[PDB]
Amino acid sequence: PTHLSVDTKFKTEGLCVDIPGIPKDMTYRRLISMMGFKMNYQVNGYPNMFITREEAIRHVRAWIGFDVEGCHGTNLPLQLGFSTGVNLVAVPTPLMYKGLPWNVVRIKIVQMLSDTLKNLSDRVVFVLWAHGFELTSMKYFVKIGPERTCCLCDRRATCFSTASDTYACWHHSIGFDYVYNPFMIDVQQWGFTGNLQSNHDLYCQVHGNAHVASCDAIMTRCLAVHECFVKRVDWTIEYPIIGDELKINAACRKVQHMVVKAALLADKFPVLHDIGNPKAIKCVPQADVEWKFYDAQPCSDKAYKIEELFYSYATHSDKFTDGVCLFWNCNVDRYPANSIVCRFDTRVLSNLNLPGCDGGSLYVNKHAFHTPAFDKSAFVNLKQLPFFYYSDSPCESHGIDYVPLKSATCITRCNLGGAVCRHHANEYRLYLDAYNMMISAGFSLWVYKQFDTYNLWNTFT
């Protein structure tokens, strides 16, 4: 019960316009054969081209929407569309490209998938709303066989060259002409009524149809992400490390302690309302304040309405207007003015951030968190939190070479007294590095308007 059995049934109703007469009774085994491939009863780690929803979900970083449309099968030119927004035209003889034979079109397909996937995944998962021409066009740019390794490294092979008779991973595939052991999944097997557009458009206003292949390709992956990460959410699934996940997570813990510790020292709030992750611990355990926790899961769909988060069954609702509210990745429509806020900017370009549904994004760092579209209007009662470092810790090296530090934002006893000590200079530069890691990773920080670092200087006297 791990891999999809080739003897599992495939519903063929979706195929019967491109492929009139298709059997109603069809397995993957007979489908794969009809697509022109031979699985030669092989136990070499590639039991099926098609995969389970669960396997697709574990390999979300690999998803590429794929769609083909008749343009004017062997007779006529095909439009090949990918969720990268690329459209190629193959002949048998937003980016749109002119008609070319399969022998060159297939080279472009390897280049495009390699550049897209090399920093994301060991594989490709073609995500389909299958009507026939996509499945019957794969023989023109795919080869299958036993699992294999790169000729230049230890990564599993994803490409093949007919020039050299060799195999490559995504990193090493320059000049390769065939996709090797792709995976794929037909969204239409999941139990949907009506066409792609009419299902996509229930959930997403951001992707339009121009009746071109890359738009269906984009809409297909959008609808898949909706089904697997918005309506359904499995926070048990771990995902591999592929970048700065560990540094970014550590940065986030450091900045949070810094910012909340400072907020308490500056304005001496008697109560902090900690709204979000129900696992959460006091980020400033030594602080003087009444720490009151409030449970809420990541909203993956729409931002929480502050009205419904606080004052539903307001049967003596807690005084959320007293003290300060901490929303650490707890997304609401409009934050109260007495708030400290970390909010992920869905618009960021990174290897951890994949395009999502209805202007939102899928942030994959240890877990997958689909995140509602970033909206500036959420922050109207707040301001951007300016950078600063604060320490009450004694000046004392205990031991990373030095250039004497000058900064207006180094809030320490030493800088008050004129000259930053070596210890606080190291800590300052380390904290600035963490802070920049975090920001570039896409997190944005916002605070109550009365917040002023000038108030921190009187905590040394």
Active site amino acids: 67, 69, 134, 211, 216
Candidates 39-47, 183-191, 296-304, 388-396: pick the segment binding ligand LRF (CB under 6 A). Answer: 296-304
61-69, 293-301, 381-389, 449-457 -> range binding ligand LRF (CB under 6 A): 293-301
Q: Which is nearer to ligand LRF, 182 or 372 (CB)?
A: 372
Annotated binding-site residue? 234 = no
Among 57, 273, 412, 438, binds Zn ion (CB under 5 A): 412
What is the per-residue binding string for Zn ion in 144-183, x denoting contact by CB under 5 A?
------x-xx-x-------------x-xx-----------
Q: Is 281 annotated as a binding residue?
A: no
Query: Are the CB atoms for 22 and 12 separated by under 8 Å?
Result: yes
- Cβ 310 to Zn ion shortest distance, Å: 31
Q: Please say which residue, 139 or 231, places its beta carbon nearer to Zn ion.
A: 231
Tell me which of Zn ion, ligand LRF, none is bound by residue 412, counting a contact when its beta carbon lies within the kind-specific cut-off of 5 to 8 angstroms: Zn ion
Select from 171-179, 308-316, 377-385, 447-455 the region that touches ligand LRF (CB under 6 A).
Answer: 308-316
Looking at beta carbons only, is 47 or 85 nearer to Zn ion? 85
208 is in an annotated binding site: no
- Taking the C-alpha atoms of residue 219 and residue 200, their distance in angstroms, rounded to an integer, is 6
Q: What is the 3-state secondary structure (H, E, C) of the chain?
A: CCCCCCCCECCCHHHCCCCCCCCCCCEHHHHHHHCCCCCCCCCCCCCCCECCHHHHHHCHHHEEEEEEEECCCCCCCEEEEECCCEEEEEECCCEEEEEEEHHHHHHHHHHHHHHHHCCCCCCCEEEECCCCHHHHHHHHCEECCCCCECCCCCCECCEEECCCCEEECHHHCCCCCEEECCEEEEHHHHCCCCCHHHHHCCCCCCCCCCCCHHHHHHHHHHHHHHHHHHCCCCCCCCCCCCCCHHHHHHHHHHHHHHHHHHHHHHHCCCEEEEEECCCCCCCCCCCCCEEEEEECCCCCCCCECHHHHHCCCCCCCCCCCCCEEEEECCCECCCCCCEEEEEECCCCCCCCEEECCCCCEEEEECEEEEECCCCHHHHCCEEECCCCEECCCCCCCCCCCCCCCCCCCEECHHHHCCCCCHHHHHHHHHHHHHHHHHHHHCEEEEEECCCCHHHHHHHCC
Examine residue 140 and tell whether it contacts ligand LRF (CB under 6 A).
Answer: no
Quote the CA–CA distance of 205 and 200 in Å, as a whole number.
9
Evaluate whether 47 touches 40 at the Cβ level (below 8 Å). no
Which of 19-27, 34-42, 202-210, 321-329 is the region at the interface with Zn ion (rule: CB under 5 A)?
202-210
Q: Does 300 bind ligand LRF (CB under 6 A)?
A: yes
Q: Which does 395 bind (CB under 5 to 8 A by kind): ligand LRF, Zn ion, none?
A: Zn ion
Burial 306-333 (b: 16+ CB within 10 A, else e): beebbeeeeeeeeebeebbbbbbbbbbb
User: Of the candidates 389, 386, 451, which has an alpha carbon nearest to the alpha carbon of residue 414?
Assistant: 389
Q: Is 59 annotated as a binding residue?
A: no
The reply to whether 256 sits near ligand LRF by the rule CB under 6 A is: no
Q: Which does 405 bind (CB under 5 to 8 A by kind): Zn ion, ligand LRF, none?
A: none
**Is the four-CA dihedral 373, 377, 382, 386 of positive or negative sign?**
positive
Tell me the window of 2-10, 340-348, 394-402, 426-434 that interacts with Zn ion (CB under 5 A): 394-402
Stretch that binds ligand LRF, among 29-37, 311-319, 380-388, 452-460 (CB under 6 A): 311-319
Name which of residues 344 to 403 contact ligand LRF (CB under 6 A).
344, 363, 365, 369, 371
Nearer to ligand LRF, 284 or 354 (CB): 354
> Any binding-site annotation on 216?
yes
Of these partners, ligand LRF, Zn ion, none, which one is at the site of residue 102 (CB under 5 to 8 Å by kind)?
none
Given the complex with ligand LRF, which of 317 and 393 has the nearer CB atom?
Answer: 317
Min dist. Cβ of residue 284 to ligand LRF (A): 19
Which of residues 44, 164, 317, 384 is near ligand LRF by CB under 6 A?
A: 317
Widest Cα–Cα separation across the chain: 87
Which of ligand LRF, Zn ion, none does residue 363 bind to, with CB < 5 to 8 Å depending on kind?
Answer: ligand LRF
Q: Is 234 in the site for ligand LRF (CB under 6 A)?
A: no
Per CB under 6 A, residues contacting ligand LRF are: 294, 298-300, 308-310, 312-313, 315, 317-318, 329, 331, 344, 363, 365, 369, 371
Per CB under 5 A, residues contacting Zn ion are: 150, 152-153, 155, 169, 171-172, 204, 207, 222, 395, 412, 414, 421, 424
List, as residue ranges, the binding site.
Answer: 67, 69, 134, 150, 153, 169, 172, 200, 204, 207, 211, 216, 222, 274-280, 395, 414, 421, 424
